């Protein structure tokens, strides 16, 4: 968590350095030389950040797998620092569980909650992820956006159990048809 934040901060500081070099007073050839080195640093930093996130997403999906069976549906709570990380967890879980539909909520301080969901390919085209996240998040007073296969949303509540119960009812209503 903190390690990821520091990594992110490092990148931001670097980004700040590129702008300082771009707007700096110096000969242009010199500017070009320093900018090339700085951009490369930025790339390394960005990759490091990506590696850290991907890894912590991997930790989570695995913990989740212990918690659940590779069933038709996974509805659960995970701690996620960012929406991007949570979305990654959903994608990995769905890579590892090809026949499962997934919706996850991550509690945030200030009573803010994020949602990401994905629908398995095997599942019927009628079942859509956007409406799934919209029912869950709209119950939490937020909003949702996405496509038929995947969607994301945000809401604000401390009653997570109610939202999870709606998430499962909505899914099972679509999954158990015929």
Residue numbers in the entry: 811 to 988
Please give the exact wording used by the authors of the publication that reports this structure:
Consistent with its absence from primate mt tRNAAla sequences, the human mt AlaRS/tRNAAla system was recently shown to be insensitive to a G3:U70 identity element. For the human mt AlaRS/tRNAAla system we show that loss of the G3:U70 identity element was accompanied by a radical reorganization of the recognition mechanism, away from sequence-specific direct readout in the acceptor stem to sequence-unspecific structural readout of the flexible tRNA elbow. The appended C-Ala domain, which plays an auxiliary role in prokaryotic AlaRSs and is dispensable for aminoacylation in the human cytoplasmic AlaRS system, plays a central role as a folding aid for the intrinsically flexible mt tRNA elbow. Fine-tuned induced-fit adaptation selects mt tRNAAla and rejects non-cognate mt tRNAs.
